[PDB]
Each structure stands twice: as structure tokens, then as C-alpha cells.
Design an enzyme around this catalytic site. Structure first.
Site, PDB file in Angstrom:
ATOM      1  N   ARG A 154     -16.554  -6.793   5.602  1.00  0.00           N
ATOM      2  CA  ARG A 154     -16.674  -5.673   4.673  1.00  0.00           C
ATOM      3  C   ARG A 154     -17.911  -5.838   3.777  1.00  0.00           C
ATOM      4  O   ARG A 154     -17.979  -5.331   2.651  1.00  0.00           O
ATOM      5  CB  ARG A 154     -15.381  -5.544   3.854  1.00  0.00           C
ATOM      6  CG  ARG A 154     -14.875  -6.859   3.242  1.00  0.00           C
ATOM      7  CD  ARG A 154     -13.645  -6.657   2.407  1.00  0.00           C
ATOM      8  NE  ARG A 154     -12.475  -7.210   3.083  1.00  0.00           N
ATOM      9  CZ  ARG A 154     -11.272  -6.642   3.114  1.00  0.00           C
ATOM     10  NH1 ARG A 154     -11.067  -5.489   2.510  1.00  0.00           N
ATOM     11  NH2 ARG A 154     -10.267  -7.220   3.755  1.00  0.00           N
ATOM     12  N   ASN A 183      -7.290  -5.901  -4.985  1.00  0.00           N
ATOM     13  CA  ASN A 183      -8.488  -5.127  -5.200  1.00  0.00           C
ATOM     14  C   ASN A 183      -8.266  -3.623  -5.376  1.00  0.00           C
ATOM     15  O   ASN A 183      -9.140  -2.907  -5.920  1.00  0.00           O
ATOM     16  CB  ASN A 183      -9.547  -5.424  -4.112  1.00  0.00           C
ATOM     17  CG  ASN A 183      -9.127  -4.978  -2.693  1.00  0.00           C
ATOM     18  OD1 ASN A 183      -8.098  -5.379  -2.166  1.00  0.00           O
ATOM     19  ND2 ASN A 183      -9.985  -4.175  -2.065  1.00  0.00           N
ATOM     20  N   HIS A 184      -7.122  -3.146  -4.889  1.00  0.00           N
ATOM     21  CA  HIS A 184      -6.772  -1.716  -4.982  1.00  0.00           C
ATOM     22  C   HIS A 184      -6.156  -1.298  -6.313  1.00  0.00           C
ATOM     23  O   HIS A 184      -5.900  -0.098  -6.534  1.00  0.00           O
ATOM     24  CB  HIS A 184      -5.863  -1.272  -3.834  1.00  0.00           C
ATOM     25  CG  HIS A 184      -6.617  -0.866  -2.627  1.00  0.00           C
ATOM     26  ND1 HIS A 184      -7.678  -0.004  -2.672  1.00  0.00           N
ATOM     27  CD2 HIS A 184      -6.512  -1.237  -1.344  1.00  0.00           C
ATOM     28  CE1 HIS A 184      -8.202   0.134  -1.475  1.00  0.00           C
ATOM     29  NE2 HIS A 184      -7.500  -0.590  -0.642  1.00  0.00           N
ATOM     30  N   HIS A 186      -4.794 -12.313  -3.935  1.00  0.00           N
ATOM     31  CA  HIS A 186      -4.850 -11.256  -2.916  1.00  0.00           C
ATOM     32  C   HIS A 186      -5.916 -11.539  -1.862  1.00  0.00           C
ATOM     33  O   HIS A 186      -5.648 -11.473  -0.663  1.00  0.00           O
ATOM     34  CB  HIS A 186      -5.082  -9.882  -3.568  1.00  0.00           C
ATOM     35  CG  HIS A 186      -5.302  -8.760  -2.587  1.00  0.00           C
ATOM     36  ND1 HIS A 186      -4.271  -8.178  -1.888  1.00  0.00           N
ATOM     37  CD2 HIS A 186      -6.426  -8.063  -2.255  1.00  0.00           C
ATOM     38  CE1 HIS A 186      -4.750  -7.212  -1.120  1.00  0.00           C
ATOM     39  NE2 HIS A 186      -6.058  -7.101  -1.343  1.00  0.00           N
ATOM     40  N   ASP A 233      -2.482  -4.923  -3.810  1.00  0.00           N
ATOM     41  CA  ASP A 233      -2.610  -3.808  -2.892  1.00  0.00           C
ATOM     42  C   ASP A 233      -1.233  -3.123  -2.649  1.00  0.00           C
ATOM     43  O   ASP A 233      -0.896  -2.774  -1.522  1.00  0.00           O
ATOM     44  CB  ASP A 233      -3.270  -4.277  -1.555  1.00  0.00           C
ATOM     45  CG  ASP A 233      -4.771  -4.399  -1.651  1.00  0.00           C
ATOM     46  OD1 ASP A 233      -5.229  -4.354  -2.815  1.00  0.00           O
ATOM     47  OD2 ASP A 233      -5.488  -4.525  -0.584  1.00  0.00           O
ATOM     48  N   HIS A 254       0.846  -1.207   0.000  1.00  0.00           N
ATOM     49  CA  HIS A 254       0.000   0.000   0.000  1.00  0.00           C
ATOM     50  C   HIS A 254       0.898   1.281   0.000  1.00  0.00           C
ATOM     51  O   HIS A 254       0.837   2.125   0.900  1.00  0.00           O
ATOM     52  CB  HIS A 254      -1.060  -0.038   1.156  1.00  0.00           C
ATOM     53  CG  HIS A 254      -2.245  -0.983   0.967  1.00  0.00           C
ATOM     54  ND1 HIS A 254      -3.191  -0.819  -0.020  1.00  0.00           N
ATOM     55  CD2 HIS A 254      -2.709  -2.012   1.744  1.00  0.00           C
ATOM     56  CE1 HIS A 254      -4.149  -1.732   0.118  1.00  0.00           C
ATOM     57  NE2 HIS A 254      -3.885  -2.480   1.182  1.00  0.00           N
ATOM     58  N   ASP A 283      -2.373   2.805  -3.207  1.00  0.00           N
ATOM     59  CA  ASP A 283      -3.317   3.359  -2.239  1.00  0.00           C
ATOM     60  C   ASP A 283      -2.818   3.457  -0.802  1.00  0.00           C
ATOM     61  O   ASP A 283      -1.948   2.695  -0.386  1.00  0.00           O
ATOM     62  CB  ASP A 283      -4.675   2.680  -2.313  1.00  0.00           C
ATOM     63  CG  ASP A 283      -5.475   3.136  -3.513  1.00  0.00           C
ATOM     64  OD1 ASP A 283      -5.205   4.240  -4.050  1.00  0.00           O
ATOM     65  OD2 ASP A 283      -6.386   2.396  -3.912  1.00  0.00           O
ATOM     66  N   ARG A 284      -3.422   4.405  -0.069  1.00  0.00           N
ATOM     67  CA  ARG A 284      -3.153   4.722   1.334  1.00  0.00           C
ATOM     68  C   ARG A 284      -1.757   5.312   1.558  1.00  0.00           C
ATOM     69  O   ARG A 284      -1.636   6.469   1.961  1.00  0.00           O
ATOM     70  CB  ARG A 284      -3.464   3.549   2.277  1.00  0.00           C
ATOM     71  CG  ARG A 284      -4.782   2.833   1.970  1.00  0.00           C
ATOM     72  CD  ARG A 284      -5.442   2.344   3.233  1.00  0.00           C
ATOM     73  NE  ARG A 284      -6.839   1.916   3.051  1.00  0.00           N
ATOM     74  CZ  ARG A 284      -7.219   0.736   2.539  1.00  0.00           C
ATOM     75  NH1 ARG A 284      -6.321  -0.145   2.112  1.00  0.00           N
ATOM     76  NH2 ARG A 284      -8.514   0.453   2.440  1.00  0.00           N
TER      77      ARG A 284
HETATM   78 FE   LIG Z   1      -5.069  -4.023   1.398  1.00  0.00          FE
HETATM   79 FE   LIG Z   2      -7.081  -5.821  -0.421  1.00  0.00          FE
END
Ligand SMILES: [Fe+3]
Ligand SMILES: [Fe+3]
Ligand SMILES: [Fe+3]
Ligand SMILES: [Fe+3]
Ligand code: NA
Lengths: 315, 316
Positions: free
Chosen positions: B218, B121-122, B170, B89, B62, B92-93
Site C-alpha cells: 500500500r 487506521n480506519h 492494528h 478497523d 469493519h 468503515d466498509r
Molecule cells: Fe482493515
Molecule cells: Fe487497517
């Protein structure tokens, strides 16, 4: 990538009015993009050392797939014996812009050393928005695929030099008497054409027969005195460029210092013009009074062909 | 592309808070994109035949460039003796998402046979819009460069299989008892993840310890009975997956059938968690009661490292 792949794509898909799966389009645009990005802003080509390689230069095709195909059937296929260069403006106006772009990209992948493209002013964001390609691309594939084409356009070289004799760009020359080949060579081309400068003039400028320089009918006009100065300064024979329609497909201009080749026959289903080609073949040229004064050059022309019941810019 | 090129990029440019010329970024994203596009939806890797090639699996990073670098300084560089896989992933972040994406892309170009990525997924449009990358990318480079990254994300494989023993995505598994490796293999991956289906479950699903299947905290939760069934049906030993934080970097789960590896230490400058890695090294495994029951596996962990005075998502 194989000739097999191109034949099926062309014959089985594009000629039946079908599109390639989006996954192939992406693979193709991306592999082509990678190839052109390894290339300098001015590609340098020669066949002096390889006698029996014919180099052909073609001009605008503006998404006229059926004539492009004919062009290939008449003049011969790209191969180790037969290099081609398309001098820009292969998208917009014509309604099969995607199909031309894709053949050219495939060909680049299959014969990376026998197939070459200069960028033309229409291989740009501003032009595609207005002139057809963007709409055609979005309709047939997607916004993402269009962006992929648009990115690939930034990678196309701006000019190509042949046998250290002929300099080829879509539009024309800068009016700067300093301009040299290494100036064109060092251009940061991966971007949109700028407002002023040699980057835009390579893509936008038109010749005139009057001496000097001025605003064009539409960048700038450059006279035969500008061409001549540039050629002798740079140890060249002639300029070949495109960007303008010629009723006779190729035109001998500026007292021989310049030729226009234009390869979009019966332009806009309207002009009834011929398309043209310029074979450079050293020492096997065919001279004609008023058309070719060079013993390395063959000028041929080709007529328009029939195409499906579709308008220009049908999107 | 050379190790020289990566070192200057990393040391002379990214570590001084400078960016690559846009022309290099494009070249890199495009050459990486091309490479992954030649790859099947499920990559298949083995080191049984090549004894001394270590295969490392890492999880989420990330955009934590400084820990990624440290990860490489601790565990060793990618090379003919040392393949790596990042299980999604990686954007992001974290505020150096571009810098991580770019190292990974370079590495892919330099070691196309020793460096591998699964999509997470990111690595999707919906997530980047919300979670940082898009803003970071647009700020640092341009919309066009962002689109180039986004396109490249569609090319990344959805799963990777190791020594015909370990399956690595992932997120997790589908709850379909039909699902097989060839099902994953044949996925039309060049697109955004769909709403339902094995495509999304590979990137979104989480395991649970309760048997069966249900909605997650989630996609879906899948129990140890689902995993076990999948493993025996497909002649596998374990699932490795990422997508969830683990305080201990890697966690041994579902009675050994599954492991989570997560490689973003001190996540969001907040969690104080370890990052993890799973070496597959056939027959040189290091067993531990409660952590690894497999003689082909070494589980290591790593601590977070200092990074410049920049917040997470400093561009969102
Ligand atoms: Fe993640
Ligand atoms: Fe993820
Ligand atoms: Fe034109
Ligand atoms: Fe033009
Ligand atoms: Na590419």
C-alpha cells in the site's frame, strides 16, 4: 481531577496567558459532558436538610475569567459546605470564555454534587458563531475542541429547582398556564434550542412589570400575573433568572415574585454594573426593604476587577 | 448501562433496522470516550494471575454487525471470566459501522476491565471520509454525532500488551531498533495519525517474510529480523496484529514471531474468508504444527453469517 489540578491550571497556565494541552481540554470537556448527561432537565437541590450548606446562585459571566475568580475569592470556594449554580451565558462576549468554561467543567468534575449549571441561550451554536466563543475556541484550541464544547452544551440542564421554593432558569417562564415543573423535567434538551416552546422560553423569555404577555424588546415578555399564577400552581416562592443586565447585580422584580441575578460586572468593559449573587441559606436570610423579603435569602453584590490588556471578543 | 440495555438495543432496535435515540448515542460515545481517555497509550493486561480469565484478541470487523454478534455467540460473552480486545478497523466498509461502534462502546462501559480496543487506521478522519463511516453516521444520526465518534477515536489506545508476552497493535512495528514498549506507552495519541513515525506504523505497517524493511504493498514492510530483534530487546514472545485479510482468519507468520488475526468473515460480501480469534489462556494452549507453537494460545476461526439485503458502504 484535584483542587491541585485546578490551581495549577488557573494560576500557572491561564493567569500567564497560556493554554491547556489539547489532550486535557478534551478529557475535561468529555468528563463534564458525561456528568451533566446523567442529570435530569431540571435539577433538584435542597439544603433544608443540610443546614450549613450554602447554595449560591450566580447569573451571566460571559467569559470574564478575572471576575469569576474574584467572585470565588469574595464569596468562597465550591465545597461540601458550599454549592454553586451558574445560570447560563458563561461563554461569549468576554475574551476568556474558554478559561471560564474549563474552570466550570473542572469544578463539575471535582464537586459533582456541589456544582451546577443551567444552560443559557449563549450555550448554543447560533450564538457562539456570532458572539465570540467559536472564534476564541478555534483560535486557542481547534475546530474539534469547539465541537466538543458545543456538544457538551446540549447536556447542560435547562432549569434547577431549590428547596422546592425557587425555580431557576437563564431566561424566563412560558406564558402557558398549564406549564409545570414536570413539564420542564421531561424536556428533551440534548439538541439546539427550538424556535418556539418552553425549551426556548426557559432560555430566552424576559419579565416585564406590566401584566400579561407580549413580544420582548429583543422570545416573549411575561408579566407578574403570569409569574404569580405559575408559582402558586407549582407551590413555589419565587423565580430566579438572569439573561438581563442589572446595574445593581441582582434586582428584586415583579413585586417580589421574581429576581434577576447577573454576575458579569462592568459588562463589555463598559456598563460599570455590579455583579450579583443570591445565597439561599434557610432561616439565615437577611431582609432588606425593597431588595429581599425572604428569610432564606442573602443578596450580595461584587465589583469588577482588573484584567489583561485584551478587548472583549478579541477573536 | 446494563446487559439488559445492550440486549434491547441489539435485539429490539438494531436487529429490526431501527436506530437509538440521538440522546443515547451521545451519552454512550461520551461515556466510552471518557473511559478510554483514562487509559495509557499502551494498555497492559494479564491473566497469569487470574487463571480462569480467557483473553480473546480479534482483528478487523469493519462494521459487520451480524458476524460480530455471531462471534459473540460462538466464542462467549464479555464478562469477568472473559476479556476481549478488538484490534482496530471496526468502522468503515461494512454497512452497520454505527451498530458495531455502539456495541463496543456499550461493552466498554459495562465491562471497563474486561473489554479493550486498539485504534486501527480506519478510526481516523481521513479514512471515515472516504471509506463509509462518515456517510453512514451522517445519514443515520447527524454530523454532530459523527464528530462525537471521531473525537472518541482519538482516545482509543494504540497497542495493548498481554501477559508481558504479546504485543498487539492494528498494523505493525516501526523499523527503529531503538523502539521499546515505553516508547509506545508515552505516545501523544489524542490526535490524527501523523505522516511518519511509530504512531502511524502501529496502525499502518505490514510484515513481510523477506528480511529487512521496505515500502509496503500500500507505511512500511518489516521483516522477521525486525520483529525478532524487537521481541528479544523487549522480552516478548510474539506480535499479534491485524490490518490484513487472511483467508484462514488467523495466520502464523514470520516463523512464529508474528500472527495476523482478522475477524471480518466473507469481507466485502466477497472474499469468502474466515474470521479469526486468538485466546490467550496460560498453559491451556492447543498446539498445532504450522498454526500455533505456543502452549498459552488457542487459535479458533469462524464463518460468515447472513445479513439483511443491504450492500457494503450502502451510504457512501
Ligand atoms: Fe482493515
Ligand atoms: Fe487497517
Ligand atoms: Fe447574557
Ligand atoms: Fe442570555
Ligand atoms: Na465523556
Amino acid at each position: 481531577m484535584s483542587q491541585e489540578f485546578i490551581s495549577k491550571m488557573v494560576n500557572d497556565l491561564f493567569l500567564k496567558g497560556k493554554y491547556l494541552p489539547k489532550k486535557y481540554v478534551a478529557a475535561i470537556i468529555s468528563h463534564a459532558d458525561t456528568l451533566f448527561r446523567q442529570e435530569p432537565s431540571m435539577v433538584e437541590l435542597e439544603n433544608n436538610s443540610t443546614p450549613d450548606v450554602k447554595i449560591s446562585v450566580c447569573g451571566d459571566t460571559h467569559g470574564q475569567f478575572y471576575d469569576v475568580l474574584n467572585l470565588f475569592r469574595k464569596f468562597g470556594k465550591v465545597g461540601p459546605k458550599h454549592t454553586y449554580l451558574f445560570n447560563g451565558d458563561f461563554v461569549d462576549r468576554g475574551s476568556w470564555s474558554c478559561e471560564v468554561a474549563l474552570l466550570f467543567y473542572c469544578l463539575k468534575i471535582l464537586h459533582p454534587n456541589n456544582f451546577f449549571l443551567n444552560r443559557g441561550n449563549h450555550e448554543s451554536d447560533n450564538m457562539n458563531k456570532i458572539y465570540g466563543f467559536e472564534d476564541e475556541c478555534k483560535y486557542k484550541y481547534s475546530q474539534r475542541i469547539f465541537n466538543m464544547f458545543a456538544q457538551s452544551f446540549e447536556s447542560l440542564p435547562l432549569a434547577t429547582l431549590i428547596n422546592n421554593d425557587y425555580l431557576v432558569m437563564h431566561g424566563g417562564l412560558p406564558s402557558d398556564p398549564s406549564a409545570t415543573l414536570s413539564d420542564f423535567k421531561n424536556i428533551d434538551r440534548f439538541a439546539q434550542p427550538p424556535r418556539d416552546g418552553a425549551f426556548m422560553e426557559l432560555l430566552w423569555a424576559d419579565p416585564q412589570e406590566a401584566n400579561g404577555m407580549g413580544p420582548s424588546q429583543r422570545g416573549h415578555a411575561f408579566g407578574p400575573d403570569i409569574t404569580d399564577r405559575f408559582l402558586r400552581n407549582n407551590k413555589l416562592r419565587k423565580i430566579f433568572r438572569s439573561h438581563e443586565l442589572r446595574m445593581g447585580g441582582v434586582q428584586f422584580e415583579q413585586k417580589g415574585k421574581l429576581m434577576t441575578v447577573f454576575s458579569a460586572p462592568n459588562y463589555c468593559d463598559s456598563q460599570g454594573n455590579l455583579g450579583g449573587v443570591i445565597h439561599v441559606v434557610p432561616g439565615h436570610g437577611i431582609l432588606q426593604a425593597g431588595r429581599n423579603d425572604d428569610q432564606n435569602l442573602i443578596i450580595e453584590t461584587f465589583e469588577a476587577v482588573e484584567h489583561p490588556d485584551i478587548k472583549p471578543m478579541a477573536y
